[PDB]
Design a protein around this ligand. Structure first.
Ligand SMILES: OC[C@H]1O[C@@](CO)(O[C@H]2O[C@H](CO)[C@@H](O)[C@H](O)[C@H]2O)[C@@H](O)[C@@H]1O
Ligand SMILES: OC[C@H]1O[C@@](CO)(O[C@H]2O[C@H](CO)[C@@H](O)[C@H](O)[C@H]2O)[C@@H](O)[C@@H]1O
Lengths: 441, 432
C-alpha cells in the first residue's frame, strides 16, 4: 500500500551520485555524501532484485580502488586489503573524487572487519544477479578478493581458526565486549570464504585457495562444536568430568563453568531452542544472543539444519524478548549495572536496551526474513513485517528503537535511515520470492 | 656474601644442556628439559655480567632457528616472526633436538608477544656485553629482528601506534583483561624498537628501519600523554578534541585521588576507545623508567608512588605484579572466574620476586637505589628460607603461593641481578 510506495520513494532519494553515476546510498537522507558499506548491502540487494545492477557494479568498482594494496607499517593508516567502513564524494576539488573513511580520525581508530566481508558477499550477489561472473574474474577483482582473504586467514598471535579482532570491529562499532572472536565476524568470515572459493581462479593462487579450502571445514566444525548453546549442551558442560584422564583437552577454551549464568539461561531457553554464542575465547564464553550472527549462520548453512530450527524455535518462543514491538534485538540481553560499566566503559550511547546494547534495529528484519524462508518458516518474517509496518512510516523510518520491547524511537536515532527502509523492503521481497536467497547463500 | 653464593649454586643447577652445551635455564630445577624465554632473561643478564656469554649466544641462535620465517595461513600454527614462549630438549630420538612451544596445544592457543620482544632485548644485551655487534649483524639475525618488527609494526585492523593483542599475551599469560593495548607489551615494544634501531643495518632493510624511526617518537608521545595517570590527569578526565573518549564514571576516580600521593603518578595498565585500565602494572611501569619511555618527571613520580604506597605495591614480598586485585563482579567478568587468578593471587595482584631486578634497575636509573635496597632487604629475609618460590599470595604477599614451585629460576636470578645492579649501576647499559 502507501507504506511500500513511500519506502521506494525514500530509497530513490538516498542514492549517491559520483561523476553523474549512482555509486551507493547515503546512511540517512537529510552526511549527504556518505555511503557506508554495511548499510549499502540491503539497498544493493533490493537494486539487484529490481534489475538496477549498475549502481552495485559502480559501488564495487569504486570501493575496490579504495582498498589499500600494500602492507602498512605506519600508525593511523589502514591495514592491507581492508575495505573502508564508509566513503564520500568530495566535490571541493575542481573535479569529484572519493574519500575513504577507514577510521583514521574516528573516535575509535579501528577499521571494522565486516565491511570487507560484506564486500565479497556483495560481489557474489552481483555476479549471481547478473548471471555473469566476468566482473569477479577481472584481475583487479581477483587481487581484491585475494587480499581480503589473506588479512583474514593470516595468523598473527592468535591461532584459532576464527578471526581475532579488537572491540567494535563490526556493525557494533563501539565498545560492547565483542573483542576476541565475536560470532558476527566468524559467520561473515565463513560466508565470505565460501563466496571467495566460488570466484577465485585457483591457478597461481594456490596458497590462498588451499588455505581457504583448509579453513572452511575447520571453521565450520569449530563454530558448531564450540559456539552452540542449548539446554542439553549446557547441562553436558556442567556434568562433564574434566579431571578425568584425557578429558581436560575436550574443553578447548578452558571455560570455567562458574562463569555461565545457568539459572537465567535455563529459564530463558525453550526446550527445543538454542543458538550460537556471542563470543568464545580462552576462559571466555559470552552467552548473549546476537541476531545478525545467528541469522547469517542459518542463511550460510554454517548452522546445521537442526541448529537452524533450534534458532527459529528460540525466536518464536521468545518473540517478546527478541522482536517485541520492533524487529529486532541486535543482541540479548542488555549489559546492565556493573557489567555495563566494566564492559562498555560507561558509553552513554550504549545504555541498557539502547543502540548496540540490546536496542532494536529494523534493518535486521531482512535477515530474519531470509533465515525464516531458508528455515521453511516464512510466517515468522510475515509477523515481523506486520509489526514493523504498524510504526515505521509514521515514525519516519528510524535507525533504531530502544527499550526491552523496542517501544521507544531510539534516543539518538536518525530518521529516514536507509537500511531501515531497505531492510523493510528487502524482507518483503524475500517473502514474495524465496528463490532470491541465492543472492546471499 | 653467603646468600649470593647460595643463589649462585642454585642458578648453576638450572642450566639446560643441548648437545653438551648450555642453551638456557629451566624454569624451576627439580620440566627438567624446558626453557621459557621470558624466564631466561634474568638468567641471561647474570651470565652476561659474569662473563659467561656462550650460553646466551647459544640461546639466541637456537631460538632464532625456531622462529617461523614465512606467512602462516593455517589454524594452530604460529604467526610469522614469533618467538616461542618456551622450548625443550627432546633427547628421546636418536639425537637430541629442540621442540618449540608456541601454545599450539595450550589452554590458550595464543603465542605470547613478550617473548619476541625480550629476544630482541637479549640480543642487544649480548652485543653490548660482548662489545661486538657481529652476531646481530649476521644476515639471519638481521632477518630475525626485521620479522619481529614487521609483525609488531604492521597494522591489521587497529591503527594506533600501540600494539593490539589478545588477552593473556605476555608474562600474564591467562585471561586478566589485558587484551587491547596493555602497558607491558607497549613498553617492551618501545624498548625493542630502540634496540632494533640500534642493530638493524639500513641497507636492505629500508622500509622497516624507516617505519621503526617513525614509530618510536610517536609511540613515546602516545604513551607519555594517554597512559599517564596522576591527580592532574584525573581532574582533566573528570572535566572532559581528545584522542580517546574516556568516561569518568568508568574509573574509580575518588579512590585514585586518595591513593595517589601529590607528586605521584604512574602509567595506566591499558588505554583504548572508551577504555582506561587504572590498575598499576609493575613490569610495564618499571621498564618504562629503564627504557626512558617515561620522562624524568614521570620516573620520579612512579618512584614517589612506590615509596609512598610501599605497603600496597611491595608489602612483605617485592612486588605486586599489578595492583589492585580484580574482585567481585569485576573478577568474574574479566577473568571468566579463573580459579588460579583469585584476588591477590598469582597474576591477579600476586607478588612476584622476579620483579625485584626491574625494581633495582629502575631505582638505580632514577637515582634512588635505596628504594630497591629496602626491597632487597625484605626479599633477602624470606627467599632463602622459603627456597626461592615462584610467587607469593595475599594483600601483603605474606603467603607462599599455593602452587608456587620452589627454586624458581627467575626468582633466584631476579634476586642476584638486583644485587648486581646495585653494586654496579653501569650494567644498566645491558638493558637500555
Ligand atoms: O551516525 C554514524 C556514526 O555512527 C556509528 C557509531 O555507532 O556507526 C553507526 O552508524 C553506521 C552508519 O549507519 C552503521 O553502519 C553502524 O553499524 C552504526 O554503529 C559510527 O561508526 C558512525 O560514524
Ligand atoms: O608452570 C608453567 C606454566 O605456568 C604458566 C601459567 O600461566 O605460566 C607461568 O609460568 C611461566 C614459566 O615460569 C611464566 O613465564 C609465566 O609468566 C607464568 O604465567 C603457563 O603458561 C606455563 O605452562
Amino acid at each position: 500500500d502507501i507504506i511500500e510506495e513511500s519506502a521506494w520513494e525514500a530509497l530513490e532519494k538516498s542514492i549517491l551520485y559520483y561523476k553523474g553515476r549512482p555509486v551507493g546510498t547515503v546512511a540517512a537522507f537529510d552526511n549527504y555524501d556518505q555511503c557506508f558499506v554495511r548499510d549499502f548491502v540491503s539497498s544493493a540487494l533490493i537494486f539487484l532484485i529490481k534489475g538496477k545492477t549498475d549502481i552495485v557494479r559502480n559501488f564495487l568498482e569504486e570501493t575496490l580502488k579504495l582498498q589499500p594494496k600494500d602492507r602498512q607499517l605506519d600508525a593511523y593508516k589502514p591495514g592491507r586489503g581492508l575495505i573502508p567502513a564508509s566513503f564520500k564524494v568530495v566535490s571541493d576539488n575542481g573535479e569529484e573524487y572519493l574519500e575513504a573513511d577507514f577510521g583514521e580520525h574516528a573516535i575509535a581508530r579501528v577499521t571494522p572487519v565486516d565491511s570487507c566481508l560484506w564486500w565479497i558477499l556483495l560481489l557474489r550477489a552481483y555476479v549471481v544477479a547478473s548471471k555473469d561472473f566476468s566482473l569477479a574474474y577481472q584481475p583487479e577483482f581477483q587481487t581484491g578478493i585475494r587480499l581480503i582473504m589473506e588479512i583474514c586467514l593470516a595468523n598473527r598471535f592468535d591461532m584459532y581458526p576464527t578471526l581475532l579482532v579488537p572491540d567494535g570491529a563490526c556493525m557494533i562499532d563501539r565498545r560492547l565486549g565483542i573483542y576476541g572472536h565475536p560470532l558476527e565476524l566468524q559467520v561473515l568470515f565463513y560466508a565470505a570464504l565460501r563466496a571467495a572459493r566460488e570466484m577465485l581462479i585457483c591457478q597461481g593462487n594456490q596458497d590462498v585457495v588451499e588455505a581457504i579450502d583448509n579453513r572452511l571445514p575447520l571453521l565450520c566444525a569449530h563454530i558448531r562444536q564450540h559456539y552452540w548453546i542449548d539446554i542439553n549442551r549446557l547441562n553436558a558442560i556442567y556434568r562433564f568430568k574434566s579431571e578425568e584422564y584425557g578429558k581436560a583437552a575436550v574443553n578447548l577454551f578452558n571455560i570455567y563453568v562458574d562463569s555461565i549464568p545457568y539459572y537465567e539461561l535455563d529459564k530463558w531457553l525453550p526446550k527445543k531452542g538454542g543458538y550460537l554464542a556471542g563470543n568464545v575465547g580462552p576462559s571466555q564464553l559470552d552467552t548473549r544472543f546476537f541476531a545478525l550472527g545467528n541469522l547469517m549462520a542459518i542463511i550460510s548453512d554454517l548452522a546445521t539444519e537442526e541448529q537452524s530450527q533450534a534458532i527459529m524455535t528460540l525466536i518464536e518462543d521468545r518473540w517478546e524478548d527478541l522482536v517485541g514491538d520492533m524487529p529486532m534485538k541486535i543482541c540479548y540481553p542488555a549489559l546492565e549495572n556493573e557489567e555495563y560499566r566494566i564492559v562498555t566503559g560507561c558509553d552513554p550511547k550504549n545504555i541498557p536496551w539502547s543502540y548496540h546494547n540490546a536496542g532494536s534495529w529494523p534493518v535486521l528484519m531482512w535477515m530474519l526474513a531470509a533465515a525464516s524462508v531458508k528455515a521453511g518458516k516464512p510466517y515468522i518474517a510475515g509477523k515481523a513485517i506486520e509489526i514493523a509496518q504498524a510504526r515505521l512510516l509514521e515514525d519516519e523510518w528510524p535507525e533504531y528503537y530502544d527499550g526491552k520491547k523496542g517501544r521507544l524511537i531510539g534516543k539518538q536515532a536518525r530518521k529516514y535511515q536507509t537500511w531501515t527502509i531497505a531492510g523493510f523492503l528487502l524482507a518483503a521481497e524475500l517473502m514474495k520470492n524465496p528463490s532470491l536467497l541465492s543472492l546471499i547463500s
